[PDB]
PDB file of C-alpha atoms and ligand atoms in Angstrom:
ATOM      1  CA  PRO A1015       0.000   0.000   0.000  1.00 13.24           C
ATOM      2  CA  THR A1016       1.564   3.318  -1.294  1.00 15.07           C
ATOM      3  CA  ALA A1017       1.597   6.466   0.912  1.00 16.26           C
ATOM      4  CA  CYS A1018      -1.207   7.959  -1.364  1.00 14.67           C
ATOM      5  CA  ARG A1019      -4.245   6.780  -3.319  1.00 16.67           C
ATOM      6  CA  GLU A1020      -4.233   5.934  -7.077  1.00 16.84           C
ATOM      7  CA  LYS A1021      -5.639   9.395  -7.993  1.00 13.90           C
ATOM      8  CA  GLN A1022      -3.134  11.240  -5.766  1.00 10.02           C
ATOM      9  CA  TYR A1023       0.647  11.699  -5.553  1.00 12.09           C
ATOM     10  CA  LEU A1024       3.057  12.269  -2.637  1.00  8.43           C
ATOM     11  CA  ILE A1025       5.144  15.456  -2.189  1.00  8.31           C
ATOM     12  CA  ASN A1026       6.441  17.308   0.953  1.00  6.87           C
ATOM     13  CA  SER A1027       4.568  14.893   3.284  1.00  9.43           C
ATOM     14  CA  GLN A1028       1.230  15.672   1.593  1.00 11.44           C
ATOM     15  CA  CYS A1029      -1.096  13.489  -0.509  1.00 12.91           C
ATOM     16  CA  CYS A1030      -2.052  15.777  -3.438  1.00 14.59           C
ATOM     17  CA  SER A1031      -4.850  15.181  -5.952  1.00 11.58           C
ATOM     18  CA  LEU A1032      -3.787  14.433  -9.494  1.00 14.92           C
ATOM     19  CA  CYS A1033      -5.325  16.824 -12.002  1.00 14.38           C
ATOM     20  CA  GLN A1034      -8.631  15.735 -13.508  1.00 16.37           C
ATOM     21  CA  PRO A1035      -9.330  14.953 -17.166  1.00 13.67           C
ATOM     22  CA  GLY A1036      -9.517  18.276 -19.052  1.00 11.89           C
ATOM     23  CA  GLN A1037      -6.964  19.977 -16.723  1.00 12.51           C
ATOM     24  CA  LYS A1038      -3.204  20.235 -16.436  1.00  8.94           C
ATOM     25  CA  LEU A1039      -0.913  20.777 -13.437  1.00  8.14           C
ATOM     26  CA  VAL A1040       0.216  24.278 -12.543  1.00 11.18           C
ATOM     27  CA  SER A1041       1.260  23.830  -8.912  1.00 12.32           C
ATOM     28  CA  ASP A1042       1.606  21.088  -6.311  1.00 13.11           C
ATOM     29  CA  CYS A1043      -0.678  20.781  -3.311  1.00 14.76           C
ATOM     30  CA  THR A1044       0.470  22.049   0.068  1.00 13.51           C
ATOM     31  CA  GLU A1045      -0.867  21.821   3.623  1.00 11.33           C
ATOM     32  CA  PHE A1046      -2.936  24.974   2.843  1.00 11.80           C
ATOM     33  CA  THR A1047      -4.073  24.212  -0.716  1.00 13.13           C
ATOM     34  CA  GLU A1048      -5.102  21.303  -2.972  1.00 16.58           C
ATOM     35  CA  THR A1049      -3.228  20.847  -6.295  1.00 20.57           C
ATOM     36  CA  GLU A1050      -3.493  23.809  -8.660  1.00 18.94           C
ATOM     37  CA  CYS A1051      -4.820  22.717 -12.003  1.00 16.73           C
ATOM     38  CA  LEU A1052      -5.689  24.818 -15.056  1.00 21.09           C
ATOM     39  CA  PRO A1053      -8.305  23.857 -17.674  1.00 18.85           C
ATOM     40  CA  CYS A1054      -6.997  22.861 -21.110  1.00 18.47           C
ATOM     41  CA  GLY A1055      -7.288  25.622 -23.750  1.00 17.41           C
ATOM     42  CA  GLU A1056     -10.142  25.575 -26.218  1.00 17.82           C
ATOM     43  CA  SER A1057      -8.233  23.700 -28.909  1.00 20.08           C
ATOM     44  CA  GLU A1058      -6.595  21.314 -26.373  1.00 19.23           C
ATOM     45  CA  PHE A1059      -7.426  18.132 -24.511  1.00 16.84           C
ATOM     46  CA  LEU A1060      -6.314  15.772 -21.745  1.00 14.81           C
ATOM     47  CA  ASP A1061      -8.363  12.528 -21.330  1.00 16.86           C
ATOM     48  CA  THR A1062      -6.859  11.199 -18.056  1.00 17.06           C
ATOM     49  CA  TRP A1063      -6.091  12.048 -14.497  1.00 17.42           C
ATOM     50  CA  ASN A1064      -2.561  13.460 -14.562  1.00 17.45           C
ATOM     51  CA  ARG A1065       0.378  15.532 -13.328  1.00 18.98           C
ATOM     52  CA  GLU A1066       1.308  16.732 -16.889  1.00 20.87           C
ATOM     53  CA  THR A1067       2.226  20.367 -17.503  1.00 18.17           C
ATOM     54  CA  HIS A1068       0.834  20.533 -21.103  1.00 18.97           C
ATOM     55  CA  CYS A1069      -2.341  19.320 -22.782  1.00 20.28           C
ATOM     56  CA  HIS A1070      -2.543  17.534 -26.163  1.00 21.89           C
ATOM     57  CA  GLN A1071      -3.385  19.779 -29.118  1.00 22.38           C
ATOM     58  CA  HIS A1072      -6.583  18.826 -30.937  1.00 21.83           C
ATOM     59  CA  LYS A1073      -5.874  16.983 -34.180  1.00 22.90           C
ATOM     60  CA  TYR A1074      -5.451  19.024 -37.391  1.00 22.18           C
ATOM     61  CA  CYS A1075      -7.718  17.892 -40.264  1.00 20.88           C
ATOM     62  CA  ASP A1076      -5.564  18.682 -43.277  1.00 22.06           C
ATOM     63  CA  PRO A1077      -7.487  19.897 -46.441  1.00 21.52           C
ATOM     64  CA  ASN A1078      -4.496  18.811 -48.557  1.00 21.19           C
ATOM     65  CA  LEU A1079      -5.139  15.144 -47.589  1.00 19.89           C
ATOM     66  CA  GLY A1080      -8.864  15.500 -48.409  1.00 19.06           C
ATOM     67  CA  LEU A1081      -9.927  15.855 -44.756  1.00 15.53           C
ATOM     68  CA  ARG A1082     -12.358  18.201 -43.009  1.00 13.80           C
ATOM     69  CA  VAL A1083     -13.467  18.456 -39.354  1.00 14.04           C
ATOM     70  CA  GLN A1084     -16.440  16.196 -38.629  1.00 15.23           C
ATOM     71  CA  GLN A1085     -16.646  17.131 -34.963  1.00 16.86           C
ATOM     72  CA  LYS A1086     -14.662  19.632 -32.877  1.00 18.26           C
ATOM     73  CA  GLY A1087     -12.872  18.191 -29.821  1.00 16.69           C
ATOM     74  CA  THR A1088     -13.621  18.985 -26.191  1.00 12.98           C
ATOM     75  CA  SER A1089     -11.391  19.412 -23.131  1.00 11.73           C
ATOM     76  CA  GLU A1090     -11.396  15.538 -22.780  1.00  9.66           C
ATOM     77  CA  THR A1091     -11.698  14.280 -26.440  1.00  9.41           C
ATOM     78  CA  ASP A1092      -9.876  14.826 -29.700  1.00 10.49           C
ATOM     79  CA  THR A1093     -11.196  16.382 -32.922  1.00 13.22           C
ATOM     80  CA  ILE A1094     -12.622  13.863 -35.373  1.00 11.11           C
ATOM     81  CA  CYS A1095     -11.915  14.190 -39.102  1.00 12.59           C
ATOM     82  CA  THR A1096     -13.851  12.909 -42.123  1.00 11.56           C
ATOM     83  CA  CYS A1097     -13.398  13.112 -45.909  1.00 13.32           C
ATOM     84  CA  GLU A1098     -14.300  16.201 -47.981  1.00 14.51           C
ATOM     85  CA  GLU A1099     -17.117  15.683 -50.506  1.00 14.95           C
ATOM     86  CA  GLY A1100     -15.518  14.300 -53.680  1.00 14.93           C
ATOM     87  CA  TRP A1101     -12.939  12.311 -51.653  1.00 13.22           C
ATOM     88  CA  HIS A1102     -13.008   8.859 -50.021  1.00 15.57           C
ATOM     89  CA  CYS A1103     -10.949   7.205 -47.244  1.00 16.34           C
ATOM     90  CA  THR A1104      -7.556   5.647 -48.257  1.00 17.00           C
ATOM     91  CA  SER A1105      -8.227   2.813 -45.732  1.00 20.33           C
ATOM     92  CA  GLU A1106     -10.641   1.965 -42.828  1.00 23.40           C
ATOM     93  CA  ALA A1107      -8.705   4.307 -40.431  1.00 22.17           C
ATOM     94  CA  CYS A1108      -9.388   7.325 -42.688  1.00 21.66           C
ATOM     95  CA  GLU A1109      -6.071   9.129 -41.957  1.00 21.98           C
ATOM     96  CA  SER A1110      -6.033  10.575 -45.458  1.00 25.56           C
ATOM     97  CA  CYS A1111      -8.367  10.607 -48.464  1.00 25.57           C
ATOM     98  CA  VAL A1112      -8.132  10.240 -52.251  1.00 24.25           C
ATOM     99  CA  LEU A1113     -10.203  11.921 -55.010  1.00 26.27           C
ATOM    100  CA  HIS A1114     -12.959   9.769 -56.586  1.00 26.97           C
ATOM    101  CA  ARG A1115     -11.675   8.262 -59.836  1.00 25.59           C
ATOM    102  CA  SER A1116     -13.372   8.487 -63.203  1.00 25.22           C
ATOM    103  CA  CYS A1117     -14.344   5.489 -65.271  1.00 25.24           C
ATOM    104  CA  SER A1118     -12.186   5.826 -68.451  1.00 24.67           C
ATOM    105  CA  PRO A1119     -13.578   5.497 -72.011  1.00 23.06           C
ATOM    106  CA  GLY A1120     -14.825   1.906 -72.508  1.00 24.79           C
ATOM    107  CA  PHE A1121     -16.011   1.784 -68.880  1.00 23.36           C
ATOM    108  CA  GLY A1122     -19.102   3.201 -67.137  1.00 24.86           C
ATOM    109  CA  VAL A1123     -20.227   3.853 -63.592  1.00 23.51           C
ATOM    110  CA  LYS A1124     -21.750   0.814 -61.913  1.00 24.92           C
ATOM    111  CA  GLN A1125     -21.754   2.432 -58.444  1.00 24.24           C
ATOM    112  CA  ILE A1126     -21.083   6.067 -57.654  1.00 21.69           C
ATOM    113  CA  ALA A1127     -18.425   6.958 -55.056  1.00 19.96           C
ATOM    114  CA  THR A1128     -19.221   7.750 -51.427  1.00 19.07           C
ATOM    115  CA  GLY A1129     -17.063   9.029 -48.559  1.00 17.64           C
ATOM    116  CA  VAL A1130     -16.026   5.391 -47.797  1.00 17.95           C
ATOM    117  CA  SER A1131     -15.845   3.857 -51.304  1.00 16.09           C
ATOM    118  CA  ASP A1132     -14.294   4.786 -54.645  1.00 18.53           C
ATOM    119  CA  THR A1133     -16.251   4.689 -57.905  1.00 18.41           C
ATOM    120  CA  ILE A1134     -17.012   1.103 -59.053  1.00 18.30           C
ATOM    121  CA  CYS A1135     -16.588   0.951 -62.879  1.00 20.15           C
ATOM    122  CA  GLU A1136     -17.643  -1.830 -65.315  1.00 19.19           C
ATOM    123  CA  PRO A1137     -16.431  -2.525 -68.868  1.00 19.97           C
ATOM    124  CA  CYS A1138     -19.171  -1.504 -71.314  1.00 19.62           C
ATOM    125  CA  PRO A1139     -20.800  -4.762 -72.452  1.00 19.88           C
ATOM    126  CA  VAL A1140     -22.197  -5.459 -75.968  1.00 18.34           C
ATOM    127  CA  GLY A1141     -24.850  -2.984 -77.045  1.00 18.78           C
ATOM    128  CA  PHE A1142     -23.377  -0.277 -74.753  1.00 16.58           C
ATOM    129  CA  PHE A1143     -20.576   2.314 -74.740  1.00 20.12           C
ATOM    130  CA  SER A1144     -18.843   5.147 -72.948  1.00 21.74           C
ATOM    131  CA  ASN A1145     -16.828   7.779 -74.806  1.00 20.11           C
ATOM    132  CA  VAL A1146     -15.935   9.929 -71.736  1.00 19.26           C
ATOM    133  CA  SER A1147     -13.704   9.812 -68.685  1.00 21.38           C
ATOM    134  CA  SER A1148     -16.316  10.365 -65.934  1.00 22.27           C
ATOM    135  CA  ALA A1149     -17.221   9.531 -62.307  1.00 22.60           C
ATOM    136  CA  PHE A1150     -20.994   9.867 -62.908  1.00 22.98           C
ATOM    137  CA  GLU A1151     -21.785   8.570 -66.442  1.00 23.93           C
ATOM    138  CA  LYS A1152     -23.223   5.086 -66.862  1.00 23.51           C
ATOM    139  CA  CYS A1153     -22.792   2.969 -69.999  1.00 26.52           C
ATOM    140  CA  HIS A1154     -25.129   4.325 -72.727  1.00 24.07           C
ATOM    141  CA  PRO A1155     -26.815   1.986 -75.246  1.00 19.11           C
ATOM    142  CA  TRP A1156     -25.741   1.880 -78.909  1.00 23.18           C
ATOM    143  CA  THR A1157     -28.037   3.725 -81.368  1.00 19.94           C
ATOM    144  CA  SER A1158     -30.540   1.440 -83.139  1.00 17.51           C
ATOM    145  CA  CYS A1159     -29.985   2.042 -86.876  1.00 16.88           C
ATOM    146  CA  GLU A1160     -33.070   0.004 -87.813  1.00 17.47           C
ATOM    147  CA  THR A1161     -35.470   2.470 -86.006  1.00 21.52           C
ATOM    148  CA  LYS A1162     -34.198   5.168 -88.467  1.00 19.99           C
ATOM    149  CA  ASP A1163     -34.427   2.845 -91.575  1.00 20.11           C
ATOM    150  CA  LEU A1164     -30.610   2.767 -91.803  1.00 20.68           C
ATOM    151  CA  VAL A1165     -27.981  -0.010 -91.387  1.00 21.82           C
ATOM    152  CA  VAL A1166     -24.860  -0.269 -89.284  1.00 23.67           C
ATOM    153  CA  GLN A1167     -22.063   1.193 -91.444  1.00 24.90           C
ATOM    154  CA  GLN A1168     -19.446   1.136 -88.614  1.00 25.84           C
ATOM    155  CA  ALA A1169     -19.736  -1.215 -85.688  1.00 27.94           C
ATOM    156  CA  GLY A1170     -20.053   0.133 -82.159  1.00 26.58           C
ATOM    157  CA  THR A1171     -17.358  -0.532 -79.557  1.00 25.16           C
ATOM    158  CA  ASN A1172     -17.091  -0.208 -75.788  1.00 23.36           C
ATOM    159  CA  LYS A1173     -15.844   3.405 -76.549  1.00 23.50           C
ATOM    160  CA  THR A1174     -17.887   4.490 -79.629  1.00 20.75           C
ATOM    161  CA  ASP A1175     -21.485   4.560 -80.802  1.00 19.12           C
ATOM    162  CA  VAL A1176     -22.549   2.909 -84.047  1.00 21.36           C
ATOM    163  CA  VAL A1177     -22.316   5.045 -87.187  1.00 17.27           C
ATOM    164  CA  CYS A1178     -25.514   4.450 -89.188  1.00 19.55           C
ATOM    165  CA  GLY A1179     -25.753   4.684 -93.004  1.00 16.98           C
ATOM    166  CA  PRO A1180     -27.959   3.767 -96.013  1.00 16.27           C
ATOM    167  CA  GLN A1181     -28.457   0.258 -97.502  1.00 17.22           C
ATOM    168  CA  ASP A1182     -26.356  -1.025-100.456  1.00 22.36           C
TER     169      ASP A1182
ATOM    170  CA  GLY B 591     -14.391 -12.334   6.380  1.00 20.56           C
ATOM    171  CA  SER B 592     -12.944  -8.894   5.345  1.00 18.68           C
ATOM    172  CA  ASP B 593     -11.592 -10.538   2.138  1.00 16.79           C
ATOM    173  CA  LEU B 594     -15.079  -9.564   0.879  1.00 14.85           C
ATOM    174  CA  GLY B 595     -14.443  -5.900   1.895  1.00 15.67           C
ATOM    175  CA  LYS B 596     -11.233  -5.820  -0.188  1.00 18.14           C
ATOM    176  CA  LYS B 597     -13.053  -7.513  -3.115  1.00 17.36           C
ATOM    177  CA  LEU B 598     -15.902  -4.899  -2.831  1.00 17.64           C
ATOM    178  CA  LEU B 599     -13.397  -2.042  -2.914  1.00 18.19           C
ATOM    179  CA  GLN B 600     -11.750  -3.483  -6.114  1.00 15.40           C
ATOM    180  CA  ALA B 601     -15.202  -4.058  -7.766  1.00 16.08           C
ATOM    181  CA  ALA B 602     -16.192  -0.424  -7.078  1.00 14.75           C
ATOM    182  CA  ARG B 603     -12.852   0.875  -8.622  1.00 14.59           C
ATOM    183  CA  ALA B 604     -13.320  -1.391 -11.661  1.00 15.34           C
ATOM    184  CA  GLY B 605     -16.940  -0.179 -12.121  1.00 14.34           C
ATOM    185  CA  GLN B 606     -18.214  -3.793 -12.004  1.00 13.91           C
ATOM    186  CA  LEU B 607     -21.876  -3.221 -10.942  1.00 13.35           C
ATOM    187  CA  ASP B 608     -22.804  -6.976 -11.040  1.00 14.84           C
ATOM    188  CA  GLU B 609     -19.799  -7.878  -8.837  1.00 15.34           C
ATOM    189  CA  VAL B 610     -20.821  -5.108  -6.342  1.00 17.60           C
ATOM    190  CA  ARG B 611     -24.389  -6.455  -6.037  1.00 15.35           C
ATOM    191  CA  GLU B 612     -23.217 -10.069  -5.597  1.00 18.55           C
ATOM    192  CA  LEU B 613     -20.544  -9.075  -2.992  1.00 18.83           C
ATOM    193  CA  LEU B 614     -23.193  -7.064  -1.033  1.00 20.34           C
ATOM    194  CA  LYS B 615     -25.593 -10.059  -1.119  1.00 20.63           C
ATOM    195  CA  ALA B 616     -22.731 -12.242   0.255  1.00 19.24           C
ATOM    196  CA  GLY B 617     -22.499 -10.051   3.409  1.00 21.30           C
ATOM    197  CA  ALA B 618     -19.601  -7.746   2.401  1.00 17.18           C
ATOM    198  CA  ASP B 619     -19.165  -4.687   4.656  1.00 17.69           C
ATOM    199  CA  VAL B 620     -20.661  -1.741   2.668  1.00 15.27           C
ATOM    200  CA  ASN B 621     -18.460   0.570   4.798  1.00 16.86           C
ATOM    201  CA  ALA B 622     -15.171  -1.288   4.191  1.00 16.41           C
ATOM    202  CA  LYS B 623     -12.230   1.148   4.347  1.00 17.67           C
ATOM    203  CA  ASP B 624      -8.981   0.827   2.404  1.00 18.97           C
ATOM    204  CA  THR B 625      -5.555   2.069   3.646  1.00 18.75           C
ATOM    205  CA  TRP B 626      -6.459   5.752   2.869  1.00 18.12           C
ATOM    206  CA  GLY B 627      -9.956   5.661   4.498  1.00 15.36           C
ATOM    207  CA  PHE B 628     -11.819   5.442   1.163  1.00 17.06           C
ATOM    208  CA  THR B 629     -15.072   3.458   1.403  1.00 16.91           C
ATOM    209  CA  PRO B 630     -16.680   1.927  -1.755  1.00 17.21           C
ATOM    210  CA  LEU B 631     -18.870   5.046  -1.835  1.00 15.48           C
ATOM    211  CA  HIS B 632     -15.763   7.350  -1.976  1.00 17.56           C
ATOM    212  CA  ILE B 633     -14.292   5.244  -4.792  1.00 17.29           C
ATOM    213  CA  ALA B 634     -17.497   5.288  -6.837  1.00 16.83           C
ATOM    214  CA  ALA B 635     -17.867   9.016  -6.227  1.00 17.32           C
ATOM    215  CA  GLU B 636     -14.340   9.632  -7.560  1.00 14.60           C
ATOM    216  CA  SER B 637     -14.630   7.424 -10.646  1.00 13.94           C
ATOM    217  CA  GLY B 638     -18.138   8.705 -11.619  1.00 11.93           C
ATOM    218  CA  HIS B 639     -19.960   5.313 -11.344  1.00 13.27           C
ATOM    219  CA  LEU B 640     -23.508   6.538 -10.547  1.00 13.68           C
ATOM    220  CA  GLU B 641     -25.274   3.152 -10.508  1.00 15.87           C
ATOM    221  CA  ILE B 642     -22.667   1.857  -8.000  1.00 18.10           C
ATOM    222  CA  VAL B 643     -23.223   4.947  -5.793  1.00 20.99           C
ATOM    223  CA  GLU B 644     -27.011   4.384  -5.664  1.00 22.33           C
ATOM    224  CA  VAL B 645     -26.805   0.636  -4.959  1.00 25.04           C
ATOM    225  CA  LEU B 646     -24.249   1.371  -2.148  1.00 26.86           C
ATOM    226  CA  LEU B 647     -26.616   3.971  -0.573  1.00 26.80           C
ATOM    227  CA  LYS B 648     -29.551   1.527  -0.841  1.00 25.93           C
ATOM    228  CA  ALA B 649     -27.451  -1.114   1.050  1.00 26.79           C
ATOM    229  CA  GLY B 650     -26.813   1.433   3.915  1.00 27.98           C
ATOM    230  CA  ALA B 651     -23.433   3.080   3.123  1.00 27.31           C
ATOM    231  CA  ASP B 652     -22.452   5.924   5.467  1.00 26.01           C
ATOM    232  CA  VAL B 653     -23.001   9.057   3.346  1.00 24.74           C
ATOM    233  CA  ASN B 654     -20.762  11.098   5.722  1.00 23.54           C
ATOM    234  CA  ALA B 655     -17.880   8.644   6.157  1.00 21.48           C
ATOM    235  CA  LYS B 656     -14.522  10.436   6.429  1.00 22.34           C
ATOM    236  CA  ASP B 657     -11.288   9.229   4.818  1.00 20.01           C
ATOM    237  CA  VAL B 658      -7.825   9.935   6.349  1.00 21.31           C
ATOM    238  CA  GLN B 659      -7.904  13.533   5.008  1.00 19.26           C
ATOM    239  CA  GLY B 660     -11.444  14.089   6.401  1.00 17.84           C
ATOM    240  CA  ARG B 661     -13.046  14.021   2.925  1.00 20.00           C
ATOM    241  CA  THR B 662     -16.623  12.767   2.718  1.00 19.90           C
ATOM    242  CA  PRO B 663     -17.978  11.275  -0.535  1.00 19.77           C
ATOM    243  CA  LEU B 664     -19.522  14.715  -1.288  1.00 21.10           C
ATOM    244  CA  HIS B 665     -16.039  16.319  -1.111  1.00 23.86           C
ATOM    245  CA  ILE B 666     -14.837  13.700  -3.600  1.00 26.87           C
ATOM    246  CA  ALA B 667     -17.787  13.948  -5.953  1.00 26.80           C
ATOM    247  CA  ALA B 668     -17.668  17.793  -5.838  1.00 27.40           C
ATOM    248  CA  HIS B 669     -13.878  17.886  -6.397  1.00 26.39           C
ATOM    249  CA  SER B 670     -14.064  15.362  -9.230  1.00 24.80           C
ATOM    250  CA  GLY B 671     -16.841  17.074 -11.193  1.00 26.82           C
ATOM    251  CA  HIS B 672     -19.619  14.426 -10.932  1.00 28.57           C
ATOM    252  CA  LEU B 673     -22.853  16.406 -10.929  1.00 29.61           C
ATOM    253  CA  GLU B 674     -25.429  13.587 -10.765  1.00 29.80           C
ATOM    254  CA  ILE B 675     -23.428  11.934  -7.927  1.00 33.49           C
ATOM    255  CA  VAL B 676     -23.390  15.217  -5.986  1.00 31.87           C
ATOM    256  CA  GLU B 677     -27.200  15.520  -6.339  1.00 34.46           C
ATOM    257  CA  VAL B 678     -27.718  11.879  -5.181  1.00 39.51           C
ATOM    258  CA  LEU B 679     -25.426  12.295  -2.132  1.00 41.19           C
ATOM    259  CA  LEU B 680     -27.365  15.435  -1.104  1.00 40.44           C
ATOM    260  CA  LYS B 681     -30.716  13.598  -1.405  1.00 40.43           C
ATOM    261  CA  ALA B 682     -29.257  10.795   0.766  1.00 43.40           C
ATOM    262  CA  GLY B 683     -28.373  13.326   3.575  1.00 45.39           C
ATOM    263  CA  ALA B 684     -24.745  14.358   2.856  1.00 46.95           C
ATOM    264  CA  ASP B 685     -23.440  17.177   5.052  1.00 47.89           C
ATOM    265  CA  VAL B 686     -23.098  20.105   2.628  1.00 49.09           C
ATOM    266  CA  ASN B 687     -20.731  22.031   4.998  1.00 48.27           C
ATOM    267  CA  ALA B 688     -18.483  19.158   6.165  1.00 46.94           C
ATOM    268  CA  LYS B 689     -14.870  20.300   6.546  1.00 49.22           C
ATOM    269  CA  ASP B 690     -11.741  18.319   5.519  1.00 49.27           C
ATOM    270  CA  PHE B 691      -8.230  18.535   7.066  1.00 47.62           C
ATOM    271  CA  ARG B 692      -7.590  21.855   5.278  1.00 53.25           C
ATOM    272  CA  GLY B 693     -11.032  23.161   6.398  1.00 51.38           C
ATOM    273  CA  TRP B 694     -12.258  22.839   2.784  1.00 54.46           C
ATOM    274  CA  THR B 695     -15.969  22.257   2.253  1.00 58.00           C
ATOM    275  CA  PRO B 696     -17.394  20.727  -0.929  1.00 57.89           C
ATOM    276  CA  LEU B 697     -18.047  24.259  -2.233  1.00 56.21           C
ATOM    277  CA  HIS B 698     -14.320  25.103  -1.756  1.00 53.48           C
ATOM    278  CA  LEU B 699     -13.380  22.020  -3.802  1.00 53.22           C
ATOM    279  CA  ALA B 700     -15.947  22.717  -6.538  1.00 51.94           C
ATOM    280  CA  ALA B 701     -14.838  26.396  -6.760  1.00 50.09           C
ATOM    281  CA  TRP B 702     -11.135  25.388  -6.836  1.00 53.56           C
ATOM    282  CA  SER B 703     -11.566  22.894  -9.680  1.00 54.83           C
ATOM    283  CA  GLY B 704     -13.962  25.108 -11.808  1.00 57.79           C
ATOM    284  CA  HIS B 705     -17.170  23.037 -11.509  1.00 54.02           C
ATOM    285  CA  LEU B 706     -19.759  25.831 -11.931  1.00 52.58           C
ATOM    286  CA  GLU B 707     -22.858  23.672 -12.177  1.00 55.12           C
ATOM    287  CA  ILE B 708     -21.764  21.847  -8.951  1.00 54.22           C
ATOM    288  CA  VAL B 709     -21.230  25.256  -7.277  1.00 56.69           C
ATOM    289  CA  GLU B 710     -24.835  26.233  -8.144  1.00 56.96           C
ATOM    290  CA  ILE B 711     -26.317  22.979  -6.782  1.00 58.71           C
ATOM    291  CA  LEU B 712     -24.330  23.240  -3.505  1.00 60.51           C
ATOM    292  CA  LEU B 713     -25.576  26.842  -2.989  1.00 62.59           C
ATOM    293  CA  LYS B 714     -29.191  25.669  -3.581  1.00 62.87           C
ATOM    294  CA  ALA B 715     -28.625  22.895  -0.981  1.00 61.29           C
ATOM    295  CA  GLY B 716     -27.476  25.530   1.620  1.00 62.45           C
ATOM    296  CA  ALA B 717     -23.674  25.644   1.306  1.00 60.61           C
ATOM    297  CA  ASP B 718     -21.993  28.365   3.325  1.00 56.91           C
ATOM    298  CA  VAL B 719     -20.494  30.897   0.886  1.00 58.43           C
ATOM    299  CA  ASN B 720     -18.665  32.592   3.782  1.00 60.76           C
ATOM    300  CA  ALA B 721     -16.991  29.340   5.025  1.00 65.20           C
ATOM    301  CA  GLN B 722     -13.299  29.928   5.624  1.00 66.42           C
ATOM    302  CA  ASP B 723     -10.515  27.352   5.426  1.00 68.59           C
ATOM    303  CA  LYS B 724      -7.576  27.118   7.879  1.00 72.30           C
ATOM    304  CA  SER B 725      -5.713  29.839   5.926  1.00 70.69           C
ATOM    305  CA  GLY B 726      -8.759  32.229   5.992  1.00 69.28           C
ATOM    306  CA  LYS B 727      -9.857  31.637   2.352  1.00 66.74           C
ATOM    307  CA  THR B 728     -13.495  31.448   1.132  1.00 66.38           C
ATOM    308  CA  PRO B 729     -14.723  29.545  -1.962  1.00 67.84           C
ATOM    309  CA  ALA B 730     -14.778  32.835  -3.920  1.00 68.11           C
ATOM    310  CA  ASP B 731     -11.104  33.459  -2.917  1.00 68.29           C
ATOM    311  CA  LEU B 732     -10.166  30.015  -4.240  1.00 70.21           C
ATOM    312  CA  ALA B 733     -12.104  30.428  -7.516  1.00 68.89           C
ATOM    313  CA  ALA B 734     -10.397  33.804  -8.133  1.00 70.07           C
ATOM    314  CA  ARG B 735      -6.929  32.404  -7.337  1.00 70.84           C
ATOM    315  CA  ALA B 736      -7.577  29.451  -9.753  1.00 70.79           C
ATOM    316  CA  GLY B 737      -8.721  31.834 -12.569  1.00 71.86           C
ATOM    317  CA  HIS B 738     -12.408  30.637 -12.421  1.00 72.60           C
ATOM    318  CA  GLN B 739     -13.879  34.149 -12.866  1.00 71.97           C
ATOM    319  CA  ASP B 740     -17.396  32.922 -13.677  1.00 71.45           C
ATOM    320  CA  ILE B 741     -17.560  31.014 -10.356  1.00 70.74           C
ATOM    321  CA  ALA B 742     -15.855  33.836  -8.375  1.00 71.63           C
ATOM    322  CA  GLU B 743     -18.578  36.204  -9.664  1.00 73.50           C
ATOM    323  CA  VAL B 744     -21.475  33.861  -8.704  1.00 75.32           C
ATOM    324  CA  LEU B 745     -19.987  33.429  -5.191  1.00 73.39           C
ATOM    325  CA  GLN B 746     -19.430  37.163  -4.660  1.00 72.19           C
ATOM    326  CA  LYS B 747     -23.073  37.727  -5.755  1.00 74.24           C
ATOM    327  CA  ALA B 748     -24.402  34.864  -3.520  1.00 76.37           C
ATOM    328  CA  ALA B 749     -22.694  36.707  -0.608  1.00 74.82           C
TER     329      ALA B 749
HETATM  330 NA1   NA C2678     -16.640   6.425 -68.942  1.00 78.14          NA
END
């Protein structure tokens, strides 16, 4: 059994309170006074009982890594970051973000990006195409030449529409 | 056996509500004291375990039990910033003007640590704003020395 309790410390024959979560130590207790503690600053935090002389700074949410502030910290909790709109988490931890990619020509959007997932792209199957690099555009169907009383003069691809033309 | 007293103290530190209930039912001393004169009630008051505090009061814990520094559970709860625990201790008959070994009341401790809402509740429950410690200092004097202006102002105005 130590000379003081778990949430205390010993100095000059006195059992002084540790500082509480959200406070840092300025001055030791004495016979005449309990421990002098000072609240953490507004952009600072300390989550534990302590004898530390500085608080932790709230986390910076760097715009240059695609982050914004989801939720401002408190005197006992850190700031929480999330991805900017148009960006998604690099991994489950979400320590940085990456811009949503575009489906290249030949490929179309199957599922649009969110803050936790990149764009899911599919190769344009037969009867469909995509001639743009885009993060929104689905595969579009090939033009029906026969609705216009024309024939297929040039075949469609994953990347190009059919070119219609007259019969021979 | 006072084995059960030591087990009850550990359960209350660990916040293990189910272990507290089952140790009480086994005939543990509710007022078991550790080396520093902390009861289970003092420990729960410090760690902010409200359900443990209420179950300890219901089983007959001494609301005004003093530790080796003369701190009651109200001193501890007030010092530590646990508002709901302070309210519950007051309902259960805690002495609002009980003095520790420095002559600090719970109001002194709340003022010193910047717990405004706890200051307001203690005043409503009849705390002595003019209470002096062994060095002559009031709660207002403490709040001002600690830089808690807001609380210093309330205490000057309650005087
Ligand atoms: Na595309």
